[PDB]
Design an enzyme around this catalytic site. Structure first.
Site, PDB file in Angstrom:
ATOM      1  N   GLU A 149       0.591  -1.312   0.088  1.00 58.89           N
ATOM      2  CA  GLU A 149       0.138   0.048   0.141  1.00 58.89           C
ATOM      3  C   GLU A 149       0.621   1.339   0.049  1.00 58.89           C
ATOM      4  OE1 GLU A 149      -2.107  -0.855   3.542  1.00 58.89           O
ATOM      5  OE2 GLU A 149      -3.134  -2.303   2.782  1.00 58.89           O
ATOM      6  N   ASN A 151       2.184  -4.994  -3.197  1.00 60.69           N
ATOM      7  CA  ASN A 151       0.593  -5.381  -2.904  1.00 60.69           C
ATOM      8  C   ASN A 151      -0.383  -3.948  -2.751  1.00 60.69           C
ATOM      9  OD1 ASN A 151      -1.300  -7.184  -2.352  1.00 60.69           O
ATOM     10  ND2 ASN A 151      -1.202  -6.700  -0.272  1.00 60.69           N
ATOM     11  N   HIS A 187     -10.512  -6.218  -1.894  1.00 60.55           N
ATOM     12  CA  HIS A 187     -11.530  -6.053  -0.760  1.00 60.55           C
ATOM     13  C   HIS A 187     -12.582  -5.112  -1.348  1.00 60.55           C
ATOM     14  CE1 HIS A 187      -8.885  -7.024   2.372  1.00 60.55           C
ATOM     15  NE2 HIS A 187      -7.840  -6.445   1.956  1.00 60.55           N
ATOM     16  N   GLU A 238      -6.147 -10.375  -1.142  1.00 55.45           N
ATOM     17  CA  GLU A 238      -7.091 -10.532   0.403  1.00 55.45           C
ATOM     18  C   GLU A 238      -8.398 -10.475   0.007  1.00 55.45           C
ATOM     19  OE1 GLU A 238      -5.189  -7.472   2.552  1.00 55.45           O
ATOM     20  OE2 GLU A 238      -3.411  -7.779   1.802  1.00 55.45           O
ATOM     21  N   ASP A 281     -12.309 -10.429  -0.298  1.00 59.08           N
ATOM     22  CA  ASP A 281     -13.457 -10.504   0.489  1.00 59.08           C
ATOM     23  C   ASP A 281     -14.387  -9.657  -0.113  1.00 59.08           C
ATOM     24  OD1 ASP A 281     -12.512  -8.033   1.598  1.00 59.08           O
ATOM     25  OD2 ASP A 281     -11.774  -9.038   3.216  1.00 59.08           O
ATOM     26  N   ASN A 305     -51.078 -25.322  -4.548  1.00 60.09           N
ATOM     27  CA  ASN A 305     -52.350 -24.038  -5.135  1.00 60.09           C
ATOM     28  C   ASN A 305     -51.811 -22.752  -5.048  1.00 60.09           C
ATOM     29  OD1 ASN A 305     -54.483 -26.257  -5.322  1.00 60.09           O
ATOM     30  ND2 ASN A 305     -54.243 -26.090  -2.974  1.00 60.09           N
ATOM     31  N   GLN A 332     -44.137 -28.880  -2.628  1.00 60.71           N
ATOM     32  CA  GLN A 332     -44.137 -30.468  -3.222  1.00 60.71           C
ATOM     33  C   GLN A 332     -43.722 -30.500  -4.533  1.00 60.71           C
ATOM     34  OE1 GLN A 332     -48.552 -31.039  -4.090  1.00 60.71           O
ATOM     35  NE2 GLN A 332     -48.764 -29.150  -4.950  1.00 60.71           N
ATOM     36  N   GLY A 348     -39.435 -40.195   0.843  1.00 62.84           N
ATOM     37  CA  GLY A 348     -39.602 -41.451   0.351  1.00 62.84           C
ATOM     38  C   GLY A 348     -39.421 -41.776  -0.909  1.00 62.84           C
ATOM     39  N   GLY A 349     -38.401 -41.104  -1.620  1.00 66.73           N
ATOM     40  CA  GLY A 349     -38.355 -41.360  -3.109  1.00 66.73           C
ATOM     41  C   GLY A 349     -39.302 -41.030  -3.973  1.00 66.73           C
TER      42      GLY A 349
HETATM   43  C1  LIG Z   1     -58.785 -22.456 -13.464  1.00 71.90           C
HETATM   44  O1  LIG Z   1     -57.702 -23.262 -14.030  1.00 71.90           O
HETATM   45  C2  LIG Z   1     -56.764 -23.216 -12.812  1.00 71.90           C
HETATM   46  C3  LIG Z   1     -57.086 -24.538 -11.878  1.00 71.90           C
HETATM   47  O2  LIG Z   1     -58.203 -24.332 -11.123  1.00 71.90           O
HETATM   48  C4  LIG Z   1     -55.956 -24.350 -10.730  1.00 71.90           C
HETATM   49  O3  LIG Z   1     -56.233 -25.341  -9.939  1.00 71.90           O
HETATM   50  C5  LIG Z   1     -54.312 -24.762 -11.686  1.00 71.90           C
HETATM   51  O4  LIG Z   1     -54.557 -25.948 -12.197  1.00 71.90           O
HETATM   52  C6  LIG Z   1     -53.305 -26.390 -12.856  1.00 71.90           C
HETATM   53  C7  LIG Z   1     -52.605 -27.174 -12.005  1.00 71.90           C
HETATM   54  O5  LIG Z   1     -52.025 -26.716 -10.733  1.00 71.90           O
HETATM   55  C8  LIG Z   1     -51.617 -27.559  -9.459  1.00 71.90           C
HETATM   56  C9  LIG Z   1     -52.729 -28.120  -8.975  1.00 71.90           C
HETATM   57  O6  LIG Z   1     -52.112 -29.028  -7.805  1.00 71.90           O
HETATM   58  C10 LIG Z   1     -51.568 -27.998  -6.652  1.00 71.90           C
HETATM   59  O7  LIG Z   1     -51.168 -28.828  -5.716  1.00 71.90           O
HETATM   60  C11 LIG Z   1     -50.438 -27.397  -7.527  1.00 71.90           C
HETATM   61  O8  LIG Z   1     -49.768 -26.394  -6.458  1.00 71.90           O
HETATM   62  C12 LIG Z   1     -50.943 -26.662  -8.693  1.00 71.90           C
HETATM   63  O9  LIG Z   1     -50.093 -25.802  -9.254  1.00 71.90           O
HETATM   64  O10 LIG Z   1     -51.199 -27.581 -12.315  1.00 71.90           O
HETATM   65  C13 LIG Z   1     -51.428 -28.292 -13.844  1.00 71.90           C
HETATM   66  C14 LIG Z   1     -52.277 -27.519 -14.687  1.00 71.90           C
HETATM   67  O11 LIG Z   1     -52.248 -28.012 -16.037  1.00 71.90           O
HETATM   68  C15 LIG Z   1     -53.385 -26.934 -14.163  1.00 71.90           C
HETATM   69  O12 LIG Z   1     -54.029 -26.049 -15.010  1.00 71.90           O
HETATM   70  O13 LIG Z   1     -54.190 -23.624 -12.548  1.00 71.90           O
HETATM   71  C16 LIG Z   1     -55.278 -23.608 -13.483  1.00 71.90           C
HETATM   72  C17 LIG Z   1     -54.753 -22.326 -14.327  1.00 71.90           C
HETATM   73  O14 LIG Z   1     -55.796 -21.831 -15.159  1.00 71.90           O
HETATM   74  O15 LIG Z   1     -53.712 -21.862 -14.269  1.00 71.90           O
HETATM   75  C1  LIG Z   2     -30.075 -49.820   0.738  1.00 76.09           C
HETATM   76  O1  LIG Z   2     -29.785 -48.449   1.755  1.00 76.09           O
HETATM   77  C2  LIG Z   2     -31.027 -47.790   1.524  1.00 76.09           C
HETATM   78  C3  LIG Z   2     -31.273 -47.240   2.920  1.00 76.09           C
HETATM   79  O2  LIG Z   2     -31.582 -48.586   3.795  1.00 76.09           O
HETATM   80  C4  LIG Z   2     -32.439 -46.349   2.904  1.00 76.09           C
HETATM   81  O3  LIG Z   2     -32.802 -46.044   4.376  1.00 76.09           O
HETATM   82  C5  LIG Z   2     -32.317 -45.124   2.206  1.00 76.09           C
HETATM   83  O4  LIG Z   2     -30.978 -44.493   2.849  1.00 76.09           O
HETATM   84  C6  LIG Z   2     -30.369 -43.246   2.196  1.00 76.09           C
HETATM   85  C7  LIG Z   2     -31.643 -41.971   2.604  1.00 76.09           C
HETATM   86  O5  LIG Z   2     -32.972 -42.273   2.284  1.00 76.09           O
HETATM   87  C8  LIG Z   2     -33.783 -41.245   2.569  1.00 76.09           C
HETATM   88  C9  LIG Z   2     -34.763 -42.049   3.663  1.00 76.09           C
HETATM   89  O6  LIG Z   2     -35.878 -41.187   3.824  1.00 76.09           O
HETATM   90  C10 LIG Z   2     -36.516 -40.788   2.761  1.00 76.09           C
HETATM   91  O7  LIG Z   2     -37.717 -39.990   3.346  1.00 76.09           O
HETATM   92  C11 LIG Z   2     -35.852 -40.020   1.947  1.00 76.09           C
HETATM   93  O8  LIG Z   2     -36.672 -39.770   0.868  1.00 76.09           O
HETATM   94  C12 LIG Z   2     -34.703 -40.966   1.366  1.00 76.09           C
HETATM   95  O9  LIG Z   2     -33.732 -40.414   0.525  1.00 76.09           O
HETATM   96  O10 LIG Z   2     -31.165 -40.738   2.110  1.00 76.09           O
HETATM   97  C13 LIG Z   2     -29.801 -40.475   2.477  1.00 76.09           C
HETATM   98  C14 LIG Z   2     -28.744 -41.549   2.178  1.00 76.09           C
HETATM   99  O11 LIG Z   2     -27.216 -41.289   2.784  1.00 76.09           O
HETATM  100  C15 LIG Z   2     -29.229 -42.767   2.847  1.00 76.09           C
HETATM  101  O12 LIG Z   2     -28.514 -44.012   2.233  1.00 76.09           O
HETATM  102  O13 LIG Z   2     -31.667 -45.497   1.064  1.00 76.09           O
HETATM  103  C16 LIG Z   2     -30.484 -46.440   0.762  1.00 76.09           C
HETATM  104  C17 LIG Z   2     -30.217 -46.602  -0.639  1.00 76.09           C
HETATM  105  O14 LIG Z   2     -29.049 -46.790  -0.925  1.00 76.09           O
HETATM  106  O15 LIG Z   2     -31.401 -46.754  -1.405  1.00 76.09           O
END
Ligand SMILES: CO[C@H]1[C@H](O)[C@@H](O)[C@@H](O[C@H]2[C@H](O[C@@H]3CO[C@@H](O)[C@H](O)[C@H]3O)OC[C@@H](O)[C@@H]2O)O[C@@H]1C(=O)O
Ligand SMILES: CO[C@H]1[C@H](O)[C@@H](O)[C@@H](O[C@H]2[C@H](O[C@@H]3CO[C@@H](O)[C@H](O)[C@H]3O)OC[C@@H](O)[C@@H]2O)O[C@@H]1C(=O)O
Ligand SMILES: O[C@@H]1[C@@H](O)[C@H](O[C@@H]2CO[C@@H](O)[C@H](O)[C@H]2O)OC[C@H]1O
Ligand code: XYP
Ligand code: XYP
Lengths: 436, 436
Positions: B128, B170, B207, B236, B238, B328, B338, B411-412
Site C-alpha cells: 500500500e 501489494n 477488498h 486478500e 472478501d 395451489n 411439493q 420416500g423417493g
Molecule cells: C382455472 O384453472 C386453474 C385451476 O383451477 C388451478 O387448480 C390450476 O391448475 C393447474 C394445476 O395446478 C396444480 C394443482 O395442484 C396443486 O397442488 C399445484 O400446486 C398446482 O400448481 O397444475 C397443472 C395445470 O395443468 C392446471 O391447469 O391452475 C389452472 C390455471 O388456469 O392456471
Molecule cells: C440400501 O440402503 C438404503 C437405505 O436402507 C435407505 O434407508 C435409504 O437411505 C438413504 C436415505 O434415504 C432417505 C430415507 O428417507 C426418505 O424420506 C428419503 O426420501 C430418502 O432419500 O437418504 C440419505 C442416504 O445417505 C441414505 O443412504 O436409501 C438407501 C439406498 O441406497 O437406497
C-alpha cells in the site's frame, strides 16, 4: 397520525408495550427507545417465580420493582408476568409435588399479588399449561400432577388477592386456530366462564417463526376467545425475520377485535431479544427503526384506503414528477441512481420487500455507501445490510435504516439525470415520493 | 480433485488460499476447514514488521514460523506478508526517518527474507504505497519521504536476499481500471519493467464493498498488468455480502488470465474476518459453507456445460420429472412445497439470488423449519436466515446452508403431491434437480 407506537395504539384505545430487562435500564440507547415508544411494560424476567420467591416464603421484589418503578416513572402501565408456571421455578419449588406444591403455588400468588395489589393492569396468572404434543391436552408438569384443578385454583386465588387486576391465561402456539393446543385452551376458558371460574383475559404470546408461522386465521382465534367473554392480548410478539407485512397483519388483527387490549413485542432491539438470531423485533442492534416499525405504526394509525403496490412499481418524486431510475438500465454495482422521465422499464421498477429492501432487476438493492449527508444512493447486490434497508414514511419520505437520512434529489434538482443522495430529512418536494 | 477449493484451483495450475491467524490454530473447527480447503497460506499478522523485528536488529520469528510450519505441514505454500509498509510499524521504526529509516527498511528485508530464504512462494515486498486521494500519487509516509526510489530499492534488496521468491507489490483499490490509484500503480510497474527493476508480481487485495465495488473491468486490469510481463494475484479477497455471483466473477477473472497465480480470501469464516460485519467470506461462523463457496468451487471446476439460468425458472426433479411446486400457488407462510407436473405458473418459478435464496412470487423464500432429517421444506417471508439459503451443487443436489442437508422428495416419491423435506445428501435421483 401519532409518531410513537404507544400513542398510536392509544388512538384506538389500545396499548403498545415491550418486555423490559432491568439490567439494560442503565443503557441510555435502550431506555431512550423504550421510554419513547411504549406505554405498557412487562418485566422480561424480574417478576417470574424464581425472581420473586428465591426461597420458600421469602419474597423478593427488588428486581421486579426496578422494572415497575421505571414503567410508572415514565407513564407506562404494567403487565405482571408470571405467577404460576412449570418453567423457571426456583430450586426449592422444582423439588415440590402434590399438596405441598399446590400450597406453595397458592402462597406464591398471594405474596406477589399482595405486594403489587392495585398496581398491575394484567397478570399472567398461569403460563404455558398446555402441551405441544398435538393432543390438545395439559403439559405434564409438577403443577399438573398436583391435580387438573390447579389452574382454576390459581385464578380463584388470584381474584381474591387483587380483584382489581385483569387475570390472564398466557400461552404460545395458540395463535393458529387449527392447532390442537389452541382449541384445548379455548375449551378450558369456555369451561371456566361457564362454571364461574375467574378469568378476564387470554394472552397470546405470538412468537412467530418458520416452525410456527403466523396464519391469517389468528383473527378468528382472537374473535373466538373474545366471544367467550374475555379480553385478549398479544403478550410476547416477535416475528422471525420481522416481515413488515406480518407485523402489520398481526397489528390489524388486534385492531379488528374490539376486545384485543393491545400488543406487547418481546423486547426493544433485536440484540435484546431472547431470539436475537431471528432479528424478530422492531428496532435493530444500533437502535434504529426497522421497516417493520413503520408498518406497525402505519397500521395503528389506521393505514390507508389504497393498499401499497405489490410485485414492483415506480417511485416518483413529487417535486420533479420524475421516477427513481437506474442509468441505462445498468446492473453494475456502485451505479448511482437518478431521477428520469417515468416509463415502463425494469430499471424503474422497484419492489419494497418485507425485509425493507428496495429491489430492482430482482437481485439488485438500493444501497447507500455511507451514513452522512451527500452519500451517493446506488445499487448493489442484495445481502441484507442495514445500508440496504429503507422505511417508506407516511409523509412520502424514504429513510435509510442505517443512516436515518432521507433519499434526496441533489440540490432539489428536478431535471432528468438528477442524482439521488442521502441527506438530513426535511419536507421538501425533493424528498417526497409516490408509489405507483 | 474437485471437492475442495485448493484442489479445484490446482486443476488449472493455480492455488486457492486464505489468511491464517495463529491465535486460531488451536481451534479444531477452524483448522478442520483451513487444512481441508486451502493450498496457500498468508500469515494475517505474524510476518509483519512489528511481529518479526520487535526491536531494531532483534528479530523474532516465533509467530511467523508457527504459521509457516502449519502451512507446510498441511500442504500449503506461503505468501510472505509483508516487508515494507507504512502502517503498523514497530515503535522503534516509526521514530526513524531519512537515510536511517532507509537503512532500517533494507536491514528488515534482509533479516526476514534471509530467515525464510527459498521457503516463500511470493513476498509482498512493498505494501500500500499509493494514496487514495484520487491523484494517483504516492502515499505520504516516513518511507516515501526517504526518497521516491524506496520502492525500487525495496525490490532490488529483496531480489538479492532471495532470488527464488516471486516479489510482489501489494495494494487495495487498484482493481477498477478507471481509478487513478490503479493507473498510478500501473505506470510504476510498467516503468519498473522497462528499467529492469526486479518486480515479478502485482497483488490485488480485492477488498470489495459498496464503497469500492467489484467491477467487471477488474479482469481488464489484471490482463493489462499481465501484459506488462508480471504475474498477478488476488491477495486478500472478501466481498461485502459475499454475493455468489461476484465471488464467481472474481474467480472466473483469474481463470481467464494465464498470469493469475491464484486467489487468497482474507480469512476462513466470517467470524474470523477483519470485517465480520460485512460477512464477506466463504464460510459462516458455525463453519458451514455459504452459497458463495459452491459458486467459487463450481467456477474453479470449469463452470457448467451451459450458462445457468438467471431469475425465474423451474426446478425439476430428476427421478420424478416433476417440478418444485407451491401447493395451489399459496402464499401462506408455512406451506410445505411439493413435486408437481411442470407447467408455466408463478408457483413454479424460482429465482436463485446472489445471497443464496430461492425466491418465488418475488418475496417468498424456500424455507427449512428445523435442521435434522425430515425437516419440512416450505415457503416463508424472505429475511435471509441461513435456513433460507441454499447451495446449488454441480451434482444437481440442492443443500441448505444452515442444515447441510439436501432437498429430498419424501420416500423417493415421484407422484404429484410428493412433499419436500431435508435429508442427508445421498446422490439419489430424489435429491437431484435441473434448472430449465
Ligand atoms: C382455472 O384453472 C386453474 C385451476 O383451477 C388451478 O387448480 C390450476 O391448475 C393447474 C394445476 O395446478 C396444480 C394443482 O395442484 C396443486 O397442488 C399445484 O400446486 C398446482 O400448481 O397444475 C397443472 C395445470 O395443468 C392446471 O391447469 O391452475 C389452472 C390455471 O388456469 O392456471
Ligand atoms: C440400501 O440402503 C438404503 C437405505 O436402507 C435407505 O434407508 C435409504 O437411505 C438413504 C436415505 O434415504 C432417505 C430415507 O428417507 C426418505 O424420506 C428419503 O426420501 C430418502 O432419500 O437418504 C440419505 C442416504 O445417505 C441414505 O443412504 O436409501 C438407501 C439406498 O441406497 O437406497
Ligand atoms: O438461562 C436462563 C434463560 O434461558 C432465561 O431466558 C428467558 C426465558 O423466558 C423468556 O421469556 C425470556 O425472554 C428469556 O430471557 O432467562 C434466565 C436465564 O437464567
Ligand atoms: O436510464 C435512462 C433510461 O431509463 C431512459 O429511458 O433513457 C435514458 C437513460 O439514462
Ligand atoms: O438537495 C439537498 C436539499 O434537500 C438540502 O436542503 O440542502 C442540500 C441539497 O443538496
Amino acid at each position: 397520525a401519532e409518531s410513537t407506537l404507544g400513542a398510536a395504539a392509544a388512538q384506538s384505545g389500545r396499548y403498545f408495550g415491550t418486555a423490559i430487562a432491568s439490567g439494560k435500564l442503565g443503557d441510555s440507547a435502550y431506555t431512550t427507545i423504550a421510554s419513547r415508544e411504549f406505554n405498557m411494560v412487562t418485566a422480561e424476567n424480574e417478576m417470574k417465580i424464581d425472581a420473586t420467591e428465591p426461597q420458600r416464603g421469602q419474597f423478593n421484589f427488588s428486581a421486579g420493582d426496578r422494572v415497575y418503578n421505571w414503567a410508572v416513572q415514565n407513564g407506562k402501565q404494567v403487565r405482571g408476568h408470571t405467577l404460576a408456571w412449570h418453567s423457571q421455578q426456583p430450586g426449592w419449588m422444582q423439588s415440590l409435588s402434590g399438596s405441598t406444591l399446590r400450597q406453595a403455588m397458592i402462597d406464591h400468588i398471594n405474596g406477589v399479588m399482595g405486594h403489587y395489589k392495585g398496581k398491575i393492569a394484567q397478570w399472567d396468572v398461569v403460563n404455558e399449561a398446555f402441551s405441544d404434543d398435538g393432543s390438545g391436552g395439559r403439559r405434564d408438569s409438577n403443577l399438573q400432577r398436583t391435580g387438573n384443578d390447579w389452574i382454576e385454583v390459581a385464578f380463584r386465588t388470584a381474584r381474591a388477592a387483587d380483584p382489581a387486576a385483569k387475570l390472564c391465561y398466557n400461552d404460545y402456539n395458540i395463535e393458529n386456530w387449527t392447532w390442537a393446543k389452541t382449541q384445548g385452551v379455548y375449551n378450558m376458558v369456555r369451561d371456566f366462564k361457564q362454571r364461574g371460574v375467574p378469568i378476564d383475559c387470554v394472552g397470546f404470546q405470538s412468537h412467530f417463526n418458520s416452525g410456527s408461522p403466523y396464519n391469517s386465521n389468528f383473527r378468528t382465534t382472537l374473535q373466538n376467545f373474545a366471544a367467550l367473554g374475555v379480553d385478549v392480548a398479544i403478550t410476547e410478539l416477535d416475528i422471525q425475520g420481522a416481515s413488515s407485512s406480518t407485523y402489520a397483519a398481526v397489528t390489524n388483527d388486534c385492531l379488528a377485535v374490539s376486545r384485543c387490549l393491545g400488543i406487547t413485542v418481546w423486547g426493544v432491539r433485536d440484540t435484546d431479544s431472547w431470539r436475537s438470531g431471528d432479528t424478530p423485533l422492531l428496532f435493530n442492534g444500533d437502535g434504529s427503526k426497522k421497516a417493520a416499525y413503520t408498518a406497525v405504526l402505519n397500521a395503528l394509525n389506521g393505514g390507508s384506503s389504497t393498499p401499497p403496490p405489490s410485485g414492483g412499481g415506480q417511485i416518483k418524486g413529487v417535486g420533479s414528477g420524475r421516477c427513481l431510475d437506474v442509468p441505462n438500465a445498468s446492473t453494475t454495482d456502485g451505479t448511482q441512481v437518478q431521477l428520469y422521465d417515468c416509463h415502463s422499464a425494469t430499471n424503474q421498477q422497484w419492489t419494497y420487500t418485507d425485509a425493507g429492501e428496495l429491489r430492482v432487476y430482482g437481485d439488485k438493492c438500493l444501497d447507500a455507501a455511507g451514513t452522512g449527508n451527500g452519500t451517493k444512493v446506488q445499487i448493489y447486490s442484495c445481502w441484507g445490510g442495514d445500508n440496504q434497508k429503507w422505511r417508506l414514511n407516511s409523509d412520502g419520505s424514504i429513510v435509510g435504516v442505517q443512516s436515518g437520512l432521507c433519499l434526496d434529489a441533489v440540490g432539489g434538482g428536478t431535471a432528468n439525470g438528477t442524482l439521488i443522495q442521502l441527506y438530513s430529512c426535511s419536507n421538501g418536494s425533493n424528498q417526497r415520493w409516490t408509489r405507483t
